[PDB]
Design a protein around this nucleic acid. Structure first.
Lengths: 105, 92, 79, 99, 90, 105, 77, 66
DNA sequence: ATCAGAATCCCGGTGCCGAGGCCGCTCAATTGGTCGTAGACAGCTCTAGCACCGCTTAAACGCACGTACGCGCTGTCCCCCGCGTTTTAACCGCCAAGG
DNA sequence: CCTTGGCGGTTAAAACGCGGGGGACAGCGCGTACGTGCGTTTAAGCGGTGCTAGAGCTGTCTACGACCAATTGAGCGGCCTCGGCACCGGGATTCTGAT
């Protein structure tokens, strides 16, 4: 049985997204294309973050992505940092950054 | 007591972008948190968009506008591309 | 008096992560005040959620919701 | 030979590098747990807690304090100081709209 | 186009019988009322969703008020709400 | 016939509030007491602000409340000020306040 | 057109903000800041305007943009 | 008005503005700038100065998360 | 410049436990069909937006100038820092008291 | 011989203190930027005059979405296996300070 996600060429679940839209009390009706679009966007964003985080993980000679890698990925990326400016990543720590004036003179 | 989550889809995407890379359970939890957050942002904004314009239906256009409002710059453009392509393919 | 359990060296460590090289002696007490306030604000809301659900157990989600409504969105505990 | 002695600041810098490199929680678990349960006890009595709830509270609290210390540091440096003081925390929190 | 103007004016006449209000000030009070409406209704909506309830009741409204309003304002608003519901119910 | 507002002892429109709740995409259903409660809260807050602003208007030897009076009323009240901490009141200006250090003497 | 936001206007704004003394370099700095702010609001505002299939930016579009930046504005509803 | 229309042209073309829209933008912009100047002033005073400098504005904006 | 000493980075190793893989249910995603109302498309309009201009003057622009605040240099005490010294909370651990 | 309750022994993390070194503070001196003012100017504001683009509104047609049976397999819960690395043992690098 071909699925909506398969038709849309996506990995993320269009049917599930549709159901969540329907029961999320967002609007009285929901268009057929809305959950496809939303699922696609969510999938894409997930891909960008996993891309950067994976890169960070390989930079640490690591094969498994951990929250630290997600933090490095997000904070070293200007637009992701903007998108998630008010978000705390548990066990992410912070970017290494020492004010120049604090260094020995 | 079955629990649903985005874990398997996040994992499929991960295998797409990094075939030889895995992910901790905690990091997966953070990804699930992320997906739910952005869903609630986009859907909320689209709801408001539909309401402002006296429309009872959230369409892909509301979703698109919401994406343009919420995401910065290139992230927004790329997301728009992915969404539009997915809808155009799906309808066909 | 458990606020004193937040010791001088713990606060020193937190400040180090925040990039602080040198620390005035009066900082620690100050920090204890600030943290206290912070906790009071989050926990309050959390308990409110817990009380609304007619529960006696504060869940991770209650905390997450409190943080979110305080504009302190937290990732990693929705599971 | 007088025993070895790093100059004030060197070990501080070392600590900065160390803790900015890592992600572990910097407050002791059990005392934080006590503090949370105490404060919560003052709103509602005989409350229980999921362990993940307290963990969430600690992650949030430490991220908050760390960020606050970044801003505080900037305030101290702005005033041509290297030492953070209560005036720097108060300025940071005032500009944040916390006070 | 609807607004809260007449109700705001009635309230104004209750608390200050010989006092009026400019058009701009009335537009700010309309903004205010709509704003607080959205805050409270939104929070109550989320409260209902979190607890898998399909109905927003006065209890969600009350909890939302306790979340959104500071201190004395919360206590007094809660008092007025409960009082109004009790009177309406009677 | 008598109104949902008359019975609740309110000036604010219970019916209207109820209708706005129903069509606001908040929940599938809305309880009978919810709009009464909400209307009461809104009326109360309005009453507090108009009270203080009316006081300011009388202090400025005016019979009409203007945005300036609303700004003065809100900002000089601690809890109203917190409640509206992220709100801009058009033509409200700011509270007169000069930092002591700037005093010439 | 950024120069249309003149020095004495910026001085007036600073005075309202309680500033007693002003560096010469402030004005250009301020202009930059102002520009950024406007770019952020107007962008979103126009987005709303185009979603409504309109060609006229309304007061409400602006209000929604400001609201979504957490810069809620009263008085233009 | 000129500045607003100019900036707006760079996002979407052949735009028209209600006068109230421009007015809203101006109230918002001026309120923002005034508040910023308050915070800037606090930074200058913090540095034992009475004179605000670009440095102060930049500190204020950094702590605001701008 | 110059060398001794402590902190740091790097080379075997290692086993272990949690993530990856897998096997067995099942309900939520998928398929098909049927109402129907909110959505899509064409036209009237006249309202508010926009282009152009005469008259006015106070806000804006260019320049004199002198000092008081910003900045460079210096004396200073005191105010945190590094490490030894205790200083204190916690998990056993065994011998003594009682039956 | 079995059961239970003290004061030590050891781990591990943390205030006191003593020397101690350098840094904010206050002062002195120097420099020049801009507030205050004066002379000159023009573009924003008032007030008209005219032209017109398109959103509100209305109307008409409709088709994708809400709703309700049937269908079924990847999603989800419960186990099974094995390798990356936190920590450990040990040597080469490298600041780091006094000389």
């Amino acid at each position: 049985a071909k699925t909506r996600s398969s038709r849309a060429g996506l990995q993320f679940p269009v049917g599930r997204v549709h159901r969540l839209l329907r029961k999320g009390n967002y609007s009285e009706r929901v268009g057929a294309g809305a959950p496809v679009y939303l699922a696609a966007v969510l999938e894409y964003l997930t891909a960008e973050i996993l891309e950067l985080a994976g890169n960070a993980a390989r930079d640490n000679k690591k094969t498994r992505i951990i929250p630290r890698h997600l933090q490095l990925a997000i904070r070293n990326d200007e637009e992701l940092n903007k998108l998630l400016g008010r978000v705390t990543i548990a066990q992410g720590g912070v970017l290494p950054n020492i004010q120049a004036v604090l260094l020995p003179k | 007591s079955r629990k649903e989550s985005y874990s398997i889809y996040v994992y499929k995407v991960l295998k797409q972008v990094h075939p030889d890379t895995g992910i901790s359970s905690k990091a997966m939890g953070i990804m699930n948190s992320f997906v739910n957050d952005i869903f609630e942002r986009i859907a909320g904004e689209a709801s408001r968009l539909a309401h402002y314009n006296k429309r009872s239906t959230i369409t892909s256009r509301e979703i698109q506008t919401a994406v343009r409002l919420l995401l910065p710059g290139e992230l927004a453009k790329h997301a728009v591309s992915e969404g539009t392509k997915a809808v155009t393919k799906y309808t066909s | 008096d458990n606020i004193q359990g937040i010791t001088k060296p713990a606060i020193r460590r937190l400040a180090r992560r925040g990039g602080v090289k040198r620390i005035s002696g009066l900082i620690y007490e100050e920090t204890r005040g600030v943290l206290k306030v912070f906790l009071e604000n989050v926990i309050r809301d959390a308990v409110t959620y817990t009380e609304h659900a007619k529960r006696k157990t504060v869940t991770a989600m209650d905390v997450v919701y409190a943080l979110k409504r305080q504009g302190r969105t937290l990732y990693g505990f929705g599971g | 030979k007088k025993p070895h002695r790093y100059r004030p600041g060197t070990v501080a810098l070392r600590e900065i590098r160390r803790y900015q490199k890592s992600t572990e929680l910097l407050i002791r678990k059990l005392p934080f747990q006590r503090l949370v349960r105490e404060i919560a006890q003052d709103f509602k009595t005989d409350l229980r807690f999921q362990s993940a709830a307290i963990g969430a509270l600690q992650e949030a609290s430490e991220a908050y304090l760390v960020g606050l210390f970044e801003d505080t540091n900037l305030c101290a440096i702005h005033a041509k100081r290297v030492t953070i003081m209560p005036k720097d925390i108060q300025l940071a929190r005032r500009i944040r709209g916390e006070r």
